[PDB]
Amino acid sequence: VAKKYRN
Amino acid sequence: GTVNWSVEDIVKGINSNNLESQLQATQAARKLLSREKQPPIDNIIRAGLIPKFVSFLGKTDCSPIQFESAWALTNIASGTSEQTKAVVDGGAIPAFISLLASPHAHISEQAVWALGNIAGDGSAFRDLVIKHGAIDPLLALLAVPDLSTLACGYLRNLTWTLSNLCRNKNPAPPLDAVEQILPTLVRLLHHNDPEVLADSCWAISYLTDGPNERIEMVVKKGVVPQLVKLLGATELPIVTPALRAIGNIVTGTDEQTQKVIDAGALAVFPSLLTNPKTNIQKEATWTMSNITAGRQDQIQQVVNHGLVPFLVGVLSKADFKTQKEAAWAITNYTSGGTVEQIVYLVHCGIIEPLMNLLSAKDTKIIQVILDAISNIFQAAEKLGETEKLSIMIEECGGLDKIEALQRHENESVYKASLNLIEKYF
Structure with missing residues (x-):
């Protein structure tokens, strides 16, 4: 994945 | 609240x-x-x-x-x-x-x-x-004496961000930014955390996905032996990008490819060409095809490492996409190899699975395989052994397949077939 969401 | x-x-x-x-x-x-x-x-x-x-x-x-x-x-x-x-x-x-x-x-x-x-x-x-x-x-x-003193999540995030700065093409990243980033990446590639290693390998794989100049700037940094070592890692998330990077490198010049061989890469291929992850076998076989496209002394090293029987294995049985890469690896080996290297290929049993794959509905692989057969027939000529090979092709049912192909859509295909048919059959 090029982008990462912070949970 | x-x-x-x-x-x-x-x-x-x-x-x-x-x-x-x-x-x-x-x-x-x-x-x-x-x-x-x-x-x-x-x-x-x-x-x-x-x-x-x-x-x-x-x-x-x-x-x-x-x-x-x-x-x-x-x-x-x-x-x-x-x-x-x-x-x-x-x-x-x-x-x-x-x-x-x-x-x-x-x-x-x-x-x-x-x-x-x-x-x-x-x-x-x-x-x-x-x-x-x-x-x-x-x-x-990241300018610290020892990366180990950084918090783990923090270093992982830095690594991943730097790899996004290395990623994508059309265009690739500015040459000067790549030069600026590379010494720090080489350092990250020797760090002991598995996610840092995986993302450092991904960054290296992006940087080597390009023309020979881009590959060279990575190879000049001396990273190839470390990449070959990660190629041996037990973690699949490290192996996958290490192998992609090594595969990208061997699409470069024969001298860049020689650095991969000199570093010991071939010794890992018996496990990679039998890896239970389909994608690893596919990319290992792709990598092999760009080595068999090299010089005769590089083909020789594939031979000495016991890798031809492994190519025969993937051609015999593998996911179809891996098999298409094996067909390429074989056609490359046969257009570049010596007569003796080609004879060796046949003695390891390449003919029967080559022929079995003639039944595939993929015009490209059929083209690739007829090229290979033609190459092998050319070697046999120099030995005056074309008839021994024709029979071998007969006995495993290859002739049937080539005949049928005369009646095939494509031009090379039915053209390639009639020629072998009328030349040796």
Whole structure:
């Protein structure tokens, strides 16, 4: 994945 | 307190004249935007919040609101291109770059993360982050005597962001940025954490996905032996990018390929060509095809390492895409190899599975295999052994297949067949 969401 | 607010309440708090009220509302926004499902990113964009988050990044006097707003924007920037674009359009890039210097580790880490999502969107945003001067302060965060003293999550985020600065093509990253980044990446590639290693290998794989000059700039750094070593790792998330990088390198010149062989790579191929992960066998076989496309002394090394029986194995039985790579590896070996290397191939049993694959509905692989057979017939000629081979092809039912192919759609295909048919059959 090029982008990462912070949970 | 800040759990489950509506957007309208968040808007109300952010517009109040009260920094604490703005801080609580921003944190509420950060909470909406970090929930497990369907975060309301577009609703937050439409309420006009991005410009307020961005100016809160600049509140040096209130570090908690810098953090909340950075985290909110990171998550917006993590979504579609249009969503990342809205973050950028709000001026986030220079504001995040200024947070890289924050004395608060959790805040510069959030800025690193945000910049990775931005650069990760594609080449234009990546290069815009680089123009805004992101690389120097990113690299200063890693300028320590020993990477082991950095918090683990923090180093992982830096590594992943640097790899997004290395990623994508059309165009590839500016040559000077790549030169600036590379010594730090080489250092990360010797670090002991598996996620740092995986992402360092991915960055190296992007940098070697290009013309020979790009490959050379990586190979000149001396990383090939470390890559071959990671090629042996037990962690699949490290093996996959290590092998992609090694595969990219062997599409370069024969001298670049020789560095991969000199480093011991071939000794890992027996396991890679039998790896239970389909994608690893496929890319190992692709890698082999770009080595059998090399010089005769490189083909010889594939032979000496016992790898021809492994090619015969993948041709005999593998996922179809791996088999197509094996067919390529064989056609390459046969156009470049000596007569004796070609004779060896037949003695390892290449003929029967080559022929079995003539029944595939893929015109390319059929073309590739007839080229190979023609090559092998050419070798047999020099030995006056064409008849021995014709029979071998007969007995395993290859003749039937070639005949049929005369009646095939494609031009090379039915053309290639009639020639062998009329030349040796």
